[PDB]
Structure formats: structure tokens, C-alpha cells
Amino acid sequence: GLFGAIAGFIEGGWQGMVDGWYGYHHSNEQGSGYAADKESTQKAIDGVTNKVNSIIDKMNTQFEAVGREFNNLERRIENLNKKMEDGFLDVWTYNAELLVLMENERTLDFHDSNVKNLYDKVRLQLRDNAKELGNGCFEFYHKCDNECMESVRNGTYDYPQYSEEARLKREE
Amino acid sequence: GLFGAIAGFIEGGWQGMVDGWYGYHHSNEQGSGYAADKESTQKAIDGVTNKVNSIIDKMNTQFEAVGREFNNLERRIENLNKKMEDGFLDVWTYNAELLVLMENERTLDFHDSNVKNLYDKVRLQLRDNAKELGNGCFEFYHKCDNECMESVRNGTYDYPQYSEEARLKREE
Amino acid sequence: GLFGAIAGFIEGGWQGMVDGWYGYHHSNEQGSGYAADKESTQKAIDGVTNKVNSIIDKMNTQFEAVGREFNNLERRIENLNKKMEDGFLDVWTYNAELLVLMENERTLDFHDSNVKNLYDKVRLQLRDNAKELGNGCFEFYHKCDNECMESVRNGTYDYPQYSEEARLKR
Amino acid sequence: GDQICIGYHANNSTEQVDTIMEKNVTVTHAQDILEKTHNGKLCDLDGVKPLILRDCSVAGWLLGNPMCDEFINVPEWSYIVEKANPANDLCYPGNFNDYEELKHLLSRINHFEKIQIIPKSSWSDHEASSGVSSACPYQGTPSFFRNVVWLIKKNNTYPTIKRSYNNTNQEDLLILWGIHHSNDAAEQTKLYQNPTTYISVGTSTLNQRLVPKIATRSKVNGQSGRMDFFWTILKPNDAINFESNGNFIAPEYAYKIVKKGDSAIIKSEVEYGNCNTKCQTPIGAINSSMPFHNIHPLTIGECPKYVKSNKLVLATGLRNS
Amino acid sequence: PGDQICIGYHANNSTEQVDTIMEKNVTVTHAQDILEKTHNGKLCDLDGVKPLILRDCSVAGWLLGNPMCDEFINVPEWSYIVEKANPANDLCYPGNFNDYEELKHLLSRINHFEKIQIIPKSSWSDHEASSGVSSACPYQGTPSFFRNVVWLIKKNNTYPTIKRSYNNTNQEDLLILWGIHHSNDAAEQTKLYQNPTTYISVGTSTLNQRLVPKIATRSKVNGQSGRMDFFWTILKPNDAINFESNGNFIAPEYAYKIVKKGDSAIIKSEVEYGNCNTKCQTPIGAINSSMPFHNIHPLTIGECPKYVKSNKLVLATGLRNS
Amino acid sequence: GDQICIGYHANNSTEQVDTIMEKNVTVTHAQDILEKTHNGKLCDLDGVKPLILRDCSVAGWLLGNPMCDEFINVPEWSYIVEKANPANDLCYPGNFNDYEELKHLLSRINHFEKIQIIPKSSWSDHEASSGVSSACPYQGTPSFFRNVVWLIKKNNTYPTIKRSYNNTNQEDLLILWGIHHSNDAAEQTKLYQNPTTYISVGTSTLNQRLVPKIATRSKVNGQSGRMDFFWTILKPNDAINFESNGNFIAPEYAYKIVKKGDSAIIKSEVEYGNCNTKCQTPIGAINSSMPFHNIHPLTIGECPKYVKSNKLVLATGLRNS
Ligand SMILES: *[C@@H]1O[C@H](CO)[C@@H](O[C@@H]2O[C@H](CO)[C@@H](O)[C@H](O)[C@H]2NC(C)=O)[C@H](O)[C@H]1NC(C)=O
Ligand SMILES: *[C@@H]1O[C@H](CO)[C@@H](O[C@@H]2O[C@H](CO)[C@@H](O)[C@H](O)[C@H]2NC(C)=O)[C@H](O)[C@H]1NC(C)=O
Ligand SMILES: *[C@@H]1O[C@H](CO)[C@@H](O)[C@H](O)[C@H]1NC(C)=O
Ligand SMILES: *[C@@H]1O[C@H](CO)[C@@H](O)[C@H](O)[C@H]1NC(C)=O
Ligand SMILES: *[C@@H]1O[C@H](CO)[C@@H](O)[C@H](O)[C@H]1NC(C)=O
Ligand SMILES: *[C@@H]1O[C@H](CO)[C@@H](O)[C@H](O)[C@H]1NC(C)=O
């Protein structure tokens, strides 16, 4: 959508992931398996939970209609009562409906932004050390073990350590 | 703008572009011109129509403003009736205006994001075979003849095809 | 942060910078310190302000409540008149509270984007001439004195010059 | 080096829009959604012509003021037009009781059939004519509301009146009557014999007693006497029972409510248009397809939605240079 | 040439769609429905408190004691009141209930009455207390009358002037009802009361009423062409009410103690009881829900989801899967 | 090697904003737009002092309840202040008719000017100074409303009053009057002689007829007797016409309506503060350039807009570390 990640450079999602909303999938010699981003699947569930809770609270004080009766010589005021209560019911229906439409869109793009930002989080961590295929993936110039792939996620990453078999592997 | 493409890195728009909303400009020997992006323009006239239709749909219910008459000793209720209708016209006038005002800013940012997803798309396709001017432009490290230009615009661009030739100018 | 500049790719802000909202921190041959993008910040101060004025200006027309009295056999219309004044009070409170919330987010992301749209503007000028440290910084492959640095900020950094100094490390 | 650039559209447009953050932004494409235009004329509504009361009020009309003869029998209408201040309303000063509450009843009614529930002729112990006042001139000659009779003693005697009318019709039925307020004992004696007087009216719903207020008041249209008129809706198969011994202003004609449905009463000085429209406004009609309008708040028929702004333009295109 | 890492997102088998401004029907991973669309078409206790279901009586018919409502002569604390659109038992005898909607409105503010006897039917020594009844108000076939008010008649061809006071020596407010009888002609006036010129005055620190029968000829209704007009007052604790009349008086016998004020409601419903229980009620049925919104009906009583005019209202909680 | 970093501001701010997705975002700069502050005094409004009714109700003031005499010849006011339940309302119990309507007329009036219209001494065949009661004591001594006169029979007779007054001023004219209901036929005779009385008032507009209601009522202010006052607005060049043969509470002083404009009756227990203000609310005045306030829904003057919220700050600068 707006941040070109979900269904952007990345054309689809992964049926195979189920531990969380966003994450990484690794395909190395020492194994293969999926893994979820605890630190960023959490940030988003929290944010989206505030959305849902702030929308309900914002609405919990809308008009509350009340029955009122009038006699056949108060038809003017009965019609005034009527057009009033409908009018508010409409003002609050328009409110609810559109608040939902608006925040739905923002919620999607919020997921877009979250995915792209994750890609950049890693992309900056490796630089030249890995190649950008262009469809959501990083092709390691070297060989990364399972304690190294979980280091790109761990938060920091041994580039000075790994820089060595990277230039070496680059020339050819 | 807000994704820094329209009137951002790409200084201005092309008077010369008339077959769409966003497009490419190329220049090589056979020569140069404009070919508007097919799919990403359609994606916009599809998803902006809907926006303009969504606003006319979320607005068909409004306040039925009726005249009511009151006599000389009913000044209180009459004044309540006037205040009620003023109040309702005011609320819906706000609603209509703010909705427009917020979806205008949204729309603008939507075009601005559609361009930064086009540019980004080419950038990831081209890799190092080309130089990023930062103008919204790429100068090729090889020879791109038209079947090559339609290759960039197609999303069919073969990287290894011109890869060897590319790296020579990068060095010298 | 929606655009990721703040505060994802830059961990924290700058207690040290005062001249504006967004700027640069540079350590070089003569030392280190902060200078500010006087004109970038200014576009935001321009925009944020107009936005405030507009938000205020959508409310200058609102609902004004009135003291109306009723007697002991007019309890129905007294009731009606109460539910209608409360009715509008709730509606405009909803509108102001919600608008302030909605745009507060747009204003926070606004600053986020602004920053990213600056880091992009520097990355685009330097290119092969420096490392992307990845924390908001750049390690220069070459040596950079002030007209050189004050030039990346000017918006004009004559890249073709320093190109050879960088070729040497790689 | 060969080049490829990504860029966007720009054109000859000067259409503007606004933002919460920036005003008057020139854009390449826009859609104006606000209709700001109307003919300056009142017109038919779905091929049904309005009732245009000229200078009559509705009381003027339903009571039958002698200047209101234009509207003695009226065809089906879509809506009604009044001036803010019709000169022909009550030809003889007094009150129309529950007047606004009736006007409103009348705005759900598209047609009346006028009928004679009690013929003038049939007053035989009382004097039905004269009957008239200079406050109510017809062709310059003293007259009185047509749909109603100002009854007067005959041969110096006013025998108690007892009438009935029983509604043997399909439809509901609007009935008007009234009471004369004299100015002193003499006038009370000259017109009806009896010094102490009442009028009692009765239906299944109604049960009223009216006693004349014989006082002196200041002159209005030359008269300082008063007439208080009253109405009801007589259902099918109820009957209205009259009884009075003076000061009784009797119904002659009544109205069958024959077509109910959406109608309206609007104040406007604007001439008839001689056109047709689906949407109408006190200041002229609206033929639009826009979503919004800012013509007037009071509108009749299927219309754009009203809004108070002068400018409502939606951005459909990107920033322009 | 492998050893590659990838960044990506969740997907599942979900058809749950949401709408947005620029797009409709967008299947997403997870969503949260927020609209209650569903009700049990039955009226219930709220909560553990049964409503007052007037069946076919109106509120008028109930307070006056229309003989066909004896069912409600003694009645416990209620949560809300349920009246049909058109109760067939209102006033057995034709006429008027003065200030009826103002009284109806007081009721919505009241949870419990306590009928008491303020002027015993047996305290009318020099008038005829037990002979006023109508074939318009029938109980068990036999002619009867409203049970809370007494239609006094002349006793042995004489109707002396009445002067009864009653002192509210209770702690609570009293709803007091009384009436006037409009007869059809002098003859009938003569039959029921001797006196031809008649009045009714009622006093209280607040009330200052004078009523004179309009002896006149009216269309028959329920067989009766005469009329009764009723009137009511709240008599405060320590206040006192004085009646005075020489005929046409429909005296109080039973008046009601307002023992409990709360949030109630008269609602119009054709739907009937269900021995169930809820904490939110609607004219067309009840609501057990956790939603924040509902589209059942605009009128509710009790803790309720707020009302909206929408068929569909769902929050996109996940991302746009495929 | 040499380095350059891009970054952003962070100060010593402690200010919080809110968003749909997060509460309490501490922020670099934030403008507060909600006023939460009032000097809890009632003030002048743009240089005009309000009318502090102290313990008098509107009714006790216009009728002139003896205990209210501080309001005899009141100067221009900007708005009017009543307590919730004033003690001095009607000294002699009864009703004030169309009370709530009249008050509404006052929210549009800034100044009256009392003018004697029927002078006390002009009553020559009736008793002018005998109408006093302990229900309205003045300085201990039994007294009465100072703007109306309680007429008593003279020499055991009550000849039919006929007095007319014509409005020869430029201004609308507020006129009040009353009727007294006796307790029993005895009292009726003692006060007024005539067993059956009436008051009729007329104008071009008004056609009223009051008749006393005799009855037994609980004592209020040690009086079982009740008084119903009535009012009308007499337009210029029209005339009021009074007739009565008993129970009449005649007018003496009446109110020239000399200044119209925005005004208001507010109920407030708060005392004056000898201060000025552009904006005034029942719990206190507001001096504030904020767009919005928190204070009270009812305000008068040039004021911010009311909103129920307890916090309304707009984010201005960036998220803060
Ligand atoms: C009130 O008194 C005034 C004057 O005392 C009366 O006005 C006169 O009316 C006639 C026209 O009807 C003319 O002689 C003048 O136009 C009036 N007077 C002045 C001074 O211009 C008026 O008629 C009286 N109104 C009533 C109801 O008595
Ligand atoms: C009804 O009766 C009560 C007492 O039985 C009256 O009570 C008056 O005032 C106080 C109230 O606490 C009593 O102590 C007094 O003894 C009572 N006054 C008199 C004169 O008896 C009450 O006023 C009576 N109702 C009316 C309308 O008088
Ligand atoms: C926008 O344009 C209108 C139309 O001429 C102009 O009058 C107004 O001042 C402009 N608003 C601003 C902020 O420039
Ligand atoms: C949404 O889906 C439904 C099928 O349940 C269909 O009725 C509707 O037309 C769709 N909406 C749009 C805008 O096409
Ligand atoms: C009205 O007339 C018809 C027969 O003429 C009948 O249904 C009904 O009995 C009559 N009712 C009255 C009140 O006269
Ligand atoms: C925001 O912070 C304040 C503490 O001053 C507190 O009153 C409020 O409950 C907080 N809200 C949330 C959602 O944490």
C-alpha cells in the first residue's frame, strides 16, 4: 500500500509463519525455520489495541434516545422531538461509520510501515555484507550459522567480525 | 511532499507527460521521450474514484430541515427549534468540510507515495548497473537501447544481461 | 515511528541542539559539535503553525447553549431541551477531542518523515564517498573540513572532487 | 550516459484545494462537489403545481376572506406559498385558535374537497344574512368570511340553536366555527336578544363551552369587537353537535381531506416559474447532480444536501507546478 | 550461492473483510466485529426485576382503576412499564385525562407506588357512595366503575354541599386522582344530583381549581354521551387538599404513595414476556452482548451498547492478507 | 575517520500529548488549547454591571415585593443574576402567569424605566390605601407589592371600574396586574361587596376575562387567599382597557422598555467580585485567549468554545526521549 512493503516489493505473505504478525525466515545449511519478531510484533499489537480501545471510549458518550409522548394538539413539538432524535442518531452513525473507515486504512498502512521499517532495520545492519535481491530477501555473501542469523534479530550484529569473508567472497 | 518524491527529490512535474499520472522519461541514442506508467496510473484512478464515491455514500443521510411556526407566547420553544436547526446545519457543515480537508491532504500524500514506489521499483531492478543522480534519475553504466527501456518499464529487466558491461565504467 | 527516522534508526534525540528541530552532528579534523538545518525546520514550523490555526478555525463556529426555563407542568419539553443541549455539547466535544488526537498523530509522523527526508538527502549526495553507519551517521572514507561539511548542509557537495580519496580504502 | 527518469504529471489547470496544513494548493485535477446556483423562481414539484396564495394567509383562505375568492375551490397542490405578511388574513380582528398547530396539519395535505355541511338557507328562525362588516369588504361592499355564517336574531328573538352534522364520508373532515365578542350590553342586545350567552360544540373528542367576552377593546380594522375561530377534524362517523343562544358564528362549508402526503408551507416573495424541478427552495429551484448545495437550508423535494460553505472542492489530482 | 535471510509477514485462511475509504471488501488476517446485530425477541426482567406489563390496559386505565384492570390493583416494584400501542382498556367511561403526558412522564421517573385509602367509600354519610356505576365500565358482566374514584350521587333527593379535606400525614408524595362529570341535559342533571348549578373547587398550597360541568349534547362513545374529566396532583407530605362541591364530583378513594424514584421507562411493545433476564432491554427484544455498538432499536433501557444505524461495522485488526 | 550524523531536537520538556495509538507521548513542544480557570466571581461585562437580584426573584422585582425595594429604580444592566430559590418572590401567595415566557423576554432587554400609569390617588370611588397584608410585611408593618394597588370597597359599595390607558411613549410598555381569589362568600362580601365579580382587560391584541376562584386552600405565608398576576406588552399608540367590579389588583407603575440587546438571566450563588470581564459564566468569569474552555456550558459575551474534556493539548514538536 502506502509504504510499498506488504504487497510491495514483497508480493505476498507467508502462510507458514504463525508465531507472530511480522518476522524473518532463514534458509541456511545448519537448518531452516521460521521466526517471529517479538520486539516488533509486540509494538504493533499494543498500538492496534489502543486504537480499538480509543475508538470505543470515543463513542461511549453518544446520544441516548428517550421515549416521549405528545397529544394530538402538540403535533409540532412531537415532530420537533422526532427530527431531533433522528438527527443525532444520524450524526453518531456518520461518526462511528467514518471513524472506522478512516482508522481501518491507517491500520493497514500501519502494518505496511511496520514491515518496511523491519527490512531497513536489517538492511542497515549488513550493508555490503549481503545482497538485496529485491523481493524482500538478503542473499548472504558468506555462510551464516543459526547463532548468527539470530544475531541479526538479536539487535546487534558482528560485521567487523564477518566483514572479512565478505569482501573476499565479493570479487569473484 | 511527505514521502519526499513529488516536489521533493523530483523538483517538478512533466508538462510533457499526458498519457497518465506517473511515468518515465528516457534518453539514449535512438533518442528520448515520455511513456506513462500503465498499471500504477490505473491503480490510482481506481483507488481515488472509490475515495470520491465513499464520500458521497457516507453523506446521503443528513438533516431534514423543516419550518415550524410558533405564536407570540411560545418564544421559548421557537428559540429552541431555531437553535436546534442552526446546531444541526453547523455540525454537518463542519463534518463535510473537515472530511474534505483531511482527505485532500490524504490524497496528495497518496500520489506522492505512488511515485516513490515507482522510483523505488526501478532502483531495486537496476541495482548497480546504474548511477543514482538523486534527481529522480538513473544514468546507466551500460548501453540501454529501447527494447531495454521497455525492459525497465515492464518489470522484466535482465540484470545479468548487461552486468559484465556495467562494471567496467564503474571502475575506469 | 511511521517513517522510521524517529526513533527507530536514530535511537535518541539531541539534548545538545538548540538552533532548530532537525540538524547534524559532526566530528572531523577541527572537532565536533552541532549545527542546524535552519531552512528544513523552518518549513515544518511554517506547516505545523498553519495546521494549528486551521484546527482552531474549524471550531470558531460551534454550538452555543442558552438558559431556558420551564415550569412544573412542562417537564417533557424541559427534558427535551436538556437532551438537545447535552446532545450538541457531546457532539462538539467528540469532534474537538478526536481531531486533536487524529492530527497529533499526523504531526508526530510529520516530524518523523521530515527527518528521514533529510537523511535521504544526504545519502543521495555522498554515495560511495562514505559508509552508511546505520545509526543516522556516516563514516567518511575521506577527510572532511568545514566548507565540505557545511556544503553537504548547504545542499551542494561537489562529489566529483573527493572520489579518489575513497577509492583507496576499498 | 543513457538515462531514465521517473516523474509525474503537470498540466494547464489552476483549480485549487485546501489542506489542514496548506491553503490554495494548485492541483492538476479537482472535483467541485458544491452547487452554488439556482433559478430565481418557484416551480412545479414532479409536475405538480404549488398553491400560490398571492396575498392571502391560510386562515384567510380556509375561512374564506372575501378578498380570497381566487382560492374558493382549489386543485391538488405540491406545496403552499405565503408572504411573510399576507394582507388578507383575518378580515375581522380576533384569534384563530391552534393556528400554528393547524398549519402544520395542513403540511401533510395535498388536497381538500370543499363541502357544504350546513346550508345558509336552512336558518329559518334566525337571520343568516347581515352577517356582514365593513372590516370585511368585497368589491368595496361590507361582507364576511364565506365559509362561515355570522348569525343574527330574527323578529327580536334568538331561539336556542341545536344542530348536528354526522360525518357520513370516507375521509377526515376539517370544520371551522367561531364566536363574536360584542362591545357592551346594547350591542349584545341589538344582534341576538339574549344578554347571557354560550356556544357549546361536541364530538366524541371535543366538548367545548364558549362564552362571549363583552368588553371594550381598541379598534382594529375599525372594529373593536372580536371573532375567535376554532377548528377540528371530525372523523368518519362521528358527528359534530352545535348548541348556542347567541354570538355563534356558524360553519357553512367544511373541507374533506382527500389527498394526504408530503407537502409544505414556505414563505417567499418570488414569482412562479412556469417550470418543473425535483428540488425547490424559498429563493428558487435546484437542478443539480452535485452532492452538496449552499442555496438555502429550507428545501422541498429530493435535493442535494445543504451545507453553509462557499467552497467545497475535492482533490482528485497531484500537486502542480 | 544461498545462505539467505528474508523479511516477511503473517498470512492465514480468513475471509473476514473490512472497508476503507479507497477500497471495499479487503480480506485481512484478523478483525474485530464491533456491532451487535442480534436480539431475543422477548421482554425480560432487568435485572432480577420484572417489568410492569400492563397488558391491554393503558396507564390511565391502570391508575383510575378501569374494572378490566383489577389485575393491577396491587402491584410490586418494577423496572420498566410496557404498554401496547393501543390499549383497549383506557377509560371505560369517555372523557379526558388532564395533563396525561405530564403524568406519564412522571411515571418514567418512578419505580414503585403504594395504593392507600384516603377517603373511605364508607365515609359519605349524607351522599350516595355505592350507586354510581355504568354499563360502560363493567366487571364480570355486572355494571361497575373505576375502582379508585367514587361517583357520588344524591341521597334521598338532596345533595348537600361537600367539604372534605385530606391531610397527607405520610412521609412520601401522594398522587391523587379525581374527576368531574359532564351530564347531557337539565333532566339528567336533576336525576343524579338535585342541584342545577354546580361546581367543584380543589385547594392545596399549590392547587387552586374551579370546575363547572358543561351540561351538553355529545356523540355517544362506549354507549355514553356524557363525559368524565380527570385531574391529578402530587400532594406533598404535610400538605392538605380540600374539596368542595355541590354535584358532579368524582371523589378520590384510593391514592398512590410514591415510595420509590428511579430510572424507568414506559415502552410501547407488542412483544411479550419470557421469564428470562437481561441488563439491556429494547422494545423488540433483549440484549446479551459485549459489543460496543448495536443496531437493534434506538430505545433501550439499562446498561447498553450504544445504538447505530449500520448493518456492518468491523475494525481491521490485522494486515491485508491474500 | 571523519563523521557526519543527521538528527533531531530533544529538550527538557515534560509535556504530554495523546494519539489514537498511544497515550501520554512526552513531546518536544506542545500548545495547550483548553482553559481550565475562572475567577469565581460574577463581574461587569464590557463595562456594564450586572443586575444582582440578591434574594429577589424576577417576579418580586417587577411587582415590587416590599422586601426587594433595593430594585426601585434600577440602572442599565448587562446580564441578570438570580439565586436558585429567591426568598422574596411573591409575598402574597399565588401564581405569576406566563412567567417563564416573560423571563425570556428579559434576556433581550437591558433597561426598564418605571412610569406611573394609573396614579394611586386617581381612585376616588374605591379604597386606595387599605390593601395591605402581613404576607408582605415592610419594616414590620403589613404592606404590599409596590407597583400594583389592592382596591377595597368604599362605603360598602364597589362601582364598576372603567379605566383606560393609551401608550403615548415611543417604547413598548410592560404592564402587570392581578386578581385576588377570596376564601369564602363571607370574605368576598367584606372586601368587594359584589358577590360575583370579573376583570376584563383589552388591547388590540389582548382580550382577557378573569373571574375569581373561591376555594379552601392551605395557608401559605399565613394566607389561604391567592393572587394571580398577569402581564402584557402595550405597543405605542395602542391602549389597554380595564374593567372590573371586584377582586381587581390594579396597576400603578409600569415599565418603559428603553434598551434592547443581548442579555441573560443566569442562576448563580456566587457573589459579585468588583472586576471586569469579556466572558462570564455562572460559576465565574474567564480571561483567556484559549480557543476552548472547561468551565461551564452557559456563558455570555465574547467567549471561548465549551467542551466537556479535561485535557486538550495539541502536539507541536517531535516525540521526546
Ligand atoms: C391612543 O392615543 C393616540 C393619541 O392620543 C391615538 O392616536 C390618534 O389616532 C388617530 C388615528 O386613528 C389620529 O387622530 C392620530 O393619528 C392619533 N394621535 C396622534 C398623536 O398621532 C390612538 O388612536 C389611541 N389609540 C387608542 C387605541 O385609543
Ligand atoms: C396536616 O396535619 C399536619 C399535622 O397533623 C399539619 O402539621 C403542621 O405543622 C407542623 C408540622 O410538623 C405541626 O407540628 C403543626 O402542629 C401543624 N400545624 C397545625 C396548625 O396544626 C399540616 O399543616 C396539616 N395540613 C395542612 C394543610 O394544614
Ligand atoms: C486563498 O485564495 C483566496 C481567493 O483569492 C484568497 O482571497 C485568500 O486570501 C487565500 N488564502 C490564503 C491563506 O492565502
Ligand atoms: C462487498 O461484498 C459483497 C458480497 O457479500 C457485495 O455485495 C458488495 O457489492 C461488495 N462491495 C463492493 C463495493 O463491491
Ligand atoms: C353516524 O351516522 C351513522 C349512520 O348515519 C352511524 O354509523 C352512527 O350511528 C352515527 N353516529 C352519530 C354519533 O350520530
Ligand atoms: C496518562 O498519564 C497520566 C498521569 O499523569 C494518567 O492520569 C493517565 O491515566 C495516563 N493514561 C494512560 C493511558 O496511561
In summary, what is this structure?
Chain A is mostly helical and 172 residues long. Chain A is built from 5 helices and 4 strands, in the order E-E-H-H-E-E-H-H-H.
Describe this structure in words.
Chains A, B: One of its GO terms (molecular function) is host cell surface receptor binding. Chains A, B: This is Hemagglutinin. Chains A, B: Disulfide bonds join 144-148. Chains A, B: It comes from Influenza A virus. Chains A, B: It is found in: Host apical cell membrane; Virion membrane. It is classed as viral protein. The complex is a heterohexamer, with 3 copies of chain A and 3 copies of chain D. Chain A is mainly alpha-helical and 172 residues long. Chain A has one domain (1-172): Hemagglutinin Ectodomain, Chain B (Alpha-Beta Complex). Helix content of chain A is 55%, strand content 12%. Chain A has 5 helices and 4 strands; from the N terminus they run E-E-H-H-E-E-H-H-H. In chain A, the strands form 2 sheets. In chain A, strands 1-2 form a two-stranded antiparallel ribbon. In chain A, strands 3-4 form a two-stranded antiparallel ribbon. In chain A, a hairpin with a 2-residue loop joins strand 1 and strand 2. The two termini of chain D are 28 Å apart. In chain D, 6% of the residues lie in helices and 38% in strands. In chain D, the strands form 10 sheets. In chain D, strands 9, 10, 14, 17, 20, 22 and 23 form a 7-stranded mixed β-sheet that branches. In chain D, strands 16-21-18-19 form a 4-stranded antiparallel β-sheet, with no helix packed on it. In chain D, strands 5-27-29 form a 3-stranded parallel β-sheet, with no helix packed on it. The longest helix of chain D has 7 residues, at 99-105. The radius of gyration of chain D is 29 Å and the shape is elongated. Chain D folds into 2 domains: 1-48 and 271-321, Hemagglutinin, Chain A, domain 2 (Ribbon), CATH 2.10.77; 49-270, Hemagglutinin (Ha1 Chain), Chain: A, domain 1 (Alpha-Beta Complex). Chain D has 321 residues and is mainly beta. Chain D has helices spanning 58-63, 99-105, 185-191; strands at residues 3-8, 16-17, 25-26, 30-32, 34-35, 42-45, 51-52, 80-82, 94-96, 109-116, 126-127, 133-138, 141-143, 148-150, 152-153, 161-166, 173-181, 199-202, 207-210, 226-234, 239-244, 248-251, 253-260, 265-267, 272-277, 279-280, 292-293, 300-301, 305-306, 313-315. Chains in contact: A-B, A-C, A-D, A-E, A-F, B-C, B-D, B-E, B-F, C-D, C-E, C-F, D-E, D-F, E-F. The interface between B and D is large, with 73 and 49 residues. Strand 4 of chain A pairs antiparallel with strand 1 (4-9) of chain E, so a sheet runs across the interface. One 2-acetamido-2-deoxy-beta-D-glucopyranose binds at residues 23-24 of chain F.
